[PDB]
Amino acid sequence: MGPGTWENMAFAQDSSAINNIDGYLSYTDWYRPYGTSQDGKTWYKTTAMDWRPLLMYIWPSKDVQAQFIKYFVNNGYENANYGLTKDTVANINKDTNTTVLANMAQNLRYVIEQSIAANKGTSKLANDINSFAATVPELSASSELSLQSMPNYRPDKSGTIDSDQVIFVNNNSKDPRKGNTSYADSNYRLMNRTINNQAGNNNSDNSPELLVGNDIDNSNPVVQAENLNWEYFLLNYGKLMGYNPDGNFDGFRVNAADNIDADVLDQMGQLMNDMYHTKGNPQNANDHLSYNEGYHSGAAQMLNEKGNPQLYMDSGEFYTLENVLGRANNRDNIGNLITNSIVNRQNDTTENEATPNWSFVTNHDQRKNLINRLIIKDHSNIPDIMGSAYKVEYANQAWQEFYADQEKTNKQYAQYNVPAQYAILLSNKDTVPQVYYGDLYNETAQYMQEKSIYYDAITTLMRARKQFVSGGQTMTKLNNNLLASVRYGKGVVDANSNGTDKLSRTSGMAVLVGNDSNMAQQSVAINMGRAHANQQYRNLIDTTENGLTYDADNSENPAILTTDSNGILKVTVKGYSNPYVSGYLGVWVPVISGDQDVTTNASDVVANKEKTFESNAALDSHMIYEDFSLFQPEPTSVENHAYNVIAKNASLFSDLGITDFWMAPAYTPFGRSRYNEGYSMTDRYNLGTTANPTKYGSGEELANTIAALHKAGLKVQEDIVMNQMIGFSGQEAVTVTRTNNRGMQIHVNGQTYANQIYFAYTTGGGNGQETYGGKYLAELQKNYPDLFTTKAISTGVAPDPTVRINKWSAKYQNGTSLQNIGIGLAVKLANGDYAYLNSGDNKAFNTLLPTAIS
Numbered sequence: 001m002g003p004g005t006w007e008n009m010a011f012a013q014d015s016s017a018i019n020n021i022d023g024y025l026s027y028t029d030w031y032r033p034y035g036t037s038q039d040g041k042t043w044y045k046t047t048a049m050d051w052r053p054l055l056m057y058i059w060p061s062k063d064v065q066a067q068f069i070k071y072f073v074n075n076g077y078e079n080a081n082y083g084l085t086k087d088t089v090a091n092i093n094k095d096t097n098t099t100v101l102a103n104m105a106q107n108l109r110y111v112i113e114q115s116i117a118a119n120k121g122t123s124k125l126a127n128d129i130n131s132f133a134a135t136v137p138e139l140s141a142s143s144e145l146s147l148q149s150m151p152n153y154r155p156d157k158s159g160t161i162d163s164d165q166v167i168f169v170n171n172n173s174k175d176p177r178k179g180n181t182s183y184a185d186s187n188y189r190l191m192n193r194t195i196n197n198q199a200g201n202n203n204s205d206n207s208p209e210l211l212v213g214n215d216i217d218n219s220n221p222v223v224q225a226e227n228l229n230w231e232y233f234l235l236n237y238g239k240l241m242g243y244n245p246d247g248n249f250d251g252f253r254v255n256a257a258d259n260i261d262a263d264v265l266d267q268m269g270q271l272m273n274d275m276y277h278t279k280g281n282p283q284n285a286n287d288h289l290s291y292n293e294g295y296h297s298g299a300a301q302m303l304n305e306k307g308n309p310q311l312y313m314d315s316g317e318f319y320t321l322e323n324v325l326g327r328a329n330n331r332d333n334i335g336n337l338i339t340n341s342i343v344n345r346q347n348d349t350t351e352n353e354a355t356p357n358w359s360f361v362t363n364h365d366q367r368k369n370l371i372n373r374l375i376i377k378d379h380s381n382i383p384d385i386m387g388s389a390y391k392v393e394y395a396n397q398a399w400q401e402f403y404a405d406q407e408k409t410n411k412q413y414a415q416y417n418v419p420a421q422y423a424i425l426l427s428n429k430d431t432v433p434q435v436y437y438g439d440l441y442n443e444t445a446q447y448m449q450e451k452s453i454y455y456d457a458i459t460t461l462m463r464a465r466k467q468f469v470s471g472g473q474t475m476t477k478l479n480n481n482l483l484a485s486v487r488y489g490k491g492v493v494d495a496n497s498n499g500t501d502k503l504s505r506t507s508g509m510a511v512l513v514g515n516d517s518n519m520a521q522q523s524v525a526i527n528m529g530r531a532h533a534n535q536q537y538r539n540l541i542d543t544t545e546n547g548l549t550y551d552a553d554n555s556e557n558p559a560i561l562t563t564d565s566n567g568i569l570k571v572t573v574k575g576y577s578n579p580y581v582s583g584y585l586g587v588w589v590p591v592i593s594g595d596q597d598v599t600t601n602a603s604d605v606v607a608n609k610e611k612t613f614e615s616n617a618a619l620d621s622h623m624i625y626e627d628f629s630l631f632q633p634e635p636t637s638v639e640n641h642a643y644n645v646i647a648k649n650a651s652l653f654s655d656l657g658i659t660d661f662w663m664a665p666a667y668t669p670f671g672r673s674r675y676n677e678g679y680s681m682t683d684r685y686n687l688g689t690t691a692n693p694t695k696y697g698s699g700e701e702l703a704n705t706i707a708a709l710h711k712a713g714l715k716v717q718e719d720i721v722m723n724q725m726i727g728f729s730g731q732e733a734v735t736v737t738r739t740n741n742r743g744m745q746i747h748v749n750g751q752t753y754a755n756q757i758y759f760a761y762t763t764g765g766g767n768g769q770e771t772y773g774g775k776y777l778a779e780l781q782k783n784y785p786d787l788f789t790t791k792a793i794s795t796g797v798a799p800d801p802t803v804r805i806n807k808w809s810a811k812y813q814n815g816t817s818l819q820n821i822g823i824g825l826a827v828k829l830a831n832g833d834y835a836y837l838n839s840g841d842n843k844a845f846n847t848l849l850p851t852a853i854s
């Protein structure tokens with residue numbers, strides 16, 4: 001034919017002229033037409049480089065077409081000679097006559113082609129299309145139906161929106177109005193097999209499958225085998241990488257243990273036991289300490305019934321500390337410190353009975369909640385402030401406000417009684433306490449450059465723990481608002497015991513904590529125990545009008561007090577209000593010369609063939625340290641890499657009694673993630689390189705750091721992250737439904753969507769996944785065949801090592817949190833049929849394209 005408008009057709013019906021996502025078309029994609037024109041008269045053939053946005057030629061509706069014309073004419077594509085002025089476009093809409101809309105749009109292309117020629121390229125055009133798309137709900141985030149759009153929405157301080165989710169469902173339809181995404185089908189996706197609902201018959205926890213990101217299908221047997229591969233890798237990291245051969249993790253902090261199929265917890269425990277013979281051998285289990293993150297108390301029962309392959313996280317203790325000591329006002333009673341925990345500590349004088357647990361005063365999430373609460377307070381007219389309207393500037397402002405508030409007596413945001421919270425945590429029996437990096441150091445400065453105001457107090461408590469803390473515990477109210485927590489010492493079971501150990505006499509501790517700042521002055525009597533009669537005690541910490549003292553400087557008590565013939569210590573006490581104490585804090589330890597370590601070796605405790613972790617004096621001797629913050633800044637040099645700073649300070653951590661070092665998730669971070677912290681990762685096996693370090697450093701430094709920590713006598717755990725990945729660069733056509741965090745369909749302001757093709761980012765994993773994914777499975781099966789014959793609870797089938805995951809995609813994913821791309825990107829014809837390009841391996845339908853590009 002002669003030249004004309006038919007040259008709007010695609011240059012060819014394949015991926016060389018039409019961009020596509022598994023054969024589907026996107027309105028925001030581009031194609032190569034056969035030719036183009038600036039006037040309707042002369043037509044030039046496209047070269048292979050002359051591509052054009054589909055939105056110049058097709059639209060999801062009349063309405064959107066009218067908006068496209070309106071928008072472009074009002075943003076630099078006005079031309080009176082082609083019937084396109086601000087007026088004339090002024091009142092066109094979906095009810096404008098169809099042939100005048102087509103004609104306006106054809107003339108607009110001529111005007112756009114003049115702009116392209118005038119600007120020698122498509123760059124301005126490309127930005128004008130993106131700006132336009134953002135104004136159209138179905139081509140942008142708002143059609144995804146965020147809960148943030150509800151009227152009078154109150155942002156959540158967590159900084160994630162739980163019920164902003166989509167599930168990936170099966171779709172092998174031949175109906176072109178439904179489409180087909182069968183390559184993302186799964187016979188698994190068993191969702192919410194969490195905690196006690198592992199078998200699908202006990203949802204008393206109601207713990208959600210979905211949190212944030214691309215949620216991984218930990219019910220898929222192939223994925224379960226890949227987690228074993230990943231654990232094995234991390235447990236042998238250094239020698240598998242040819243880096244420091246002693247640079248191998250000893251255990252795991254299990255991220256989101258409440259939000260993944262519980263099979264993987266069983267499986268991790270099984271692996272650890274096969275490799276290291278942990279079950280029934282306290283020495284081995286405790287050398288490979290592992291502990292599960294979670295905020296659901298039902299996990300205690302779950303872990304006990306399983307013989308405790310990991311520690312339970314005692315979140316109730318954390319909330320009790322904050323509600324009793326940490327609020328400004330409406331503090332719960334002091335006695336709640338005794339009872340409101342997974343362990344009652346009123347008179348705890350037995351071993352191997354309590355739920356093996358870890359406890360904390362702060363972690364990175366709790367600091368985050370506080371900073372976000374501040375951000376939300378400071379910027380209250382933005383309902384999507386925790387979503388896409390979040391700005392790092394608001395966090396910086398919040399941190400400036402936080403550090404200032406932390407130093408005050410009358411704190412508006414930061415916690416009260418941080419030292420007293422630690423004094424309780426670090427003396428408690430039947431727990432592995434966890435100290436937070438950000439309570440020892442100003443967490444937004446370069447790594448370990450600035451000590452926190454609480455550094456002196458917490459470190460004093462930490463060193464004293466190693467020296468003195470052991471034996472039975474008794475907590476008792478001295479008055480309605482004041483309590484004494486007493487440890488009786490190594491081999492001293494209870495208040496009536498004489499002591500069975502050479503260190504019995506010179507160990508034990510009394511911690512006095514009150515939470516009423518107006519408490520009247522009074523004398524109090526503390527029962528140190530019958531092993532501690534006529535004994536000198538040092539005033540380790542006492543309260544003053546302005547703060548704390550470590551040498552009894554201007555406190556109510558002297559540097560030494562002495563118990564009577566019954567072992568009673570008499571002490572003066574009162575209410576104070578200063579930056580360190582709102583109420584009272586006092587700590588007493590026996591006088592010694594000089595050095596003492598009450599650590600109970602695991603060889604000397606009762607072993608139980610049915611248990612892995614047991615709560616006894618040997619487990620109690622451990623202390624965990626969380627080495628990171630979410631607000632930890634990017635390093636400014638190799639010397640400031642957290643891994644190098646840590647390696648340099650290895651002996652310090654040992655001196656403080658830390659036995660188990662919790663390292664940040666070390667994985668390659670998604671660059672555009674909010675915090676660059678490692679939970680939002682693109683590669684599970686790349687822990688950074690010299691040229692491209694993570695926030696924390698390179699893999700080579702990590703291995704050296706782990707070896708340095710090992711040389712100082714510590715064990716090291718990795719934050720392992722089975723729940724999600726975030727930052728895939730590969731889009732996939734996936735069939736989805738709008739759900740809450742348990743994958744149940746919901747409405748949002750009366751609207752919803754189900755079984756829709758959505759172009760989710762799902763595919764990736766980096767060269768790490770390509771190289772290391774499933775690499776160790778043949779050897780795991782050779783040495784430990786039981787891993788791949790033990791039938792999982794949730795599925796009824798063993799993990800499957802015959803498939804290697806070299807690349808992640810939707811078929812291994814339960815779904816994703818809303819990706820902020822839009823639910824209407826997928827091109828549909830007038831009749832509702834999905835457009836489809838049959839070409840290559842995309843054979844679901846015959847080629848069906850919009851008539852505009854025929």
Ligand SMILES: OC[C@H]1O[C@H](O[C@H]2[C@H](O)[C@@H](O)[C@@H](O[C@H]3[C@H](O)[C@@H](O)[C@@H](O[C@H]4[C@H](O)[C@@H](O)[C@@H](O[C@H]5[C@H](O)[C@@H](O)[C@@H](O)O[C@@H]5CO)O[C@@H]4CO)O[C@@H]3CO)O[C@@H]2CO)[C@H](O)[C@@H](O)[C@@H]1O
Pocket residue numbers: 158159160161211212213214255256293365368386387672673674675677679680721723724725726727728729761762816817818819820821
């Ligand atoms: O747009 C393409 C992109 O879409 C998807 O990712 C985006 C998410 O949909 C979106 O929500 C947003 O994600 C943010 C998140 O909103 C924000 O809160 C922050 O997430 C942090 C948590 O704040 C932080 O607490 C931590 O959470 C852990 C927690 O430590 C742990 O103790 C326990 O609670 O489990 C949590 C999960 O392991 O880490 C997360 C992760 O960093 O930051 C997120 C990322 O900035 O933005 C996403 C990216 O654009 C898809 O998933 C992605 O593949 C696509 O590329």
Ligand SMILES: OC[C@H]1O[C@H](O[C@H]2[C@H](O)[C@@H](O)[C@@H](O)O[C@@H]2CO)[C@H](O)[C@@H](O)[C@@H]1O
Pocket residue numbers: 019030031048049050051052122123126
């Ligand atoms: O005008 C923008 C952009 O167009 C072309 O990009 C094509 C690319 O050639 C295709 O392989 C595929 O990725 O689709 C793209 C459509 O945006 C040009 O090649 C490129 O130089 C130019 O900037």
Ligand SMILES: OC[C@H]1O[C@H](O[C@H]2[C@H](O)[C@@H](O)[C@@H](O)O[C@@H]2CO)[C@H](O)[C@@H](O)[C@@H]1O
Pocket residue numbers: 634635636637638641692693694695696697
């Ligand atoms: O945010 C940029 C970049 O910061 C960090 O890289 C540092 C690097 O560690 C230093 O040695 C030095 O070269 O400066 C770089 C930044 O200017 C992070 O390691 C990296 O993840 C991050 O992308």
Ligand SMILES: [Ca+2]
Pocket residue numbers: 208209210211215216259260261723
């Ligand atoms: Ca999950």
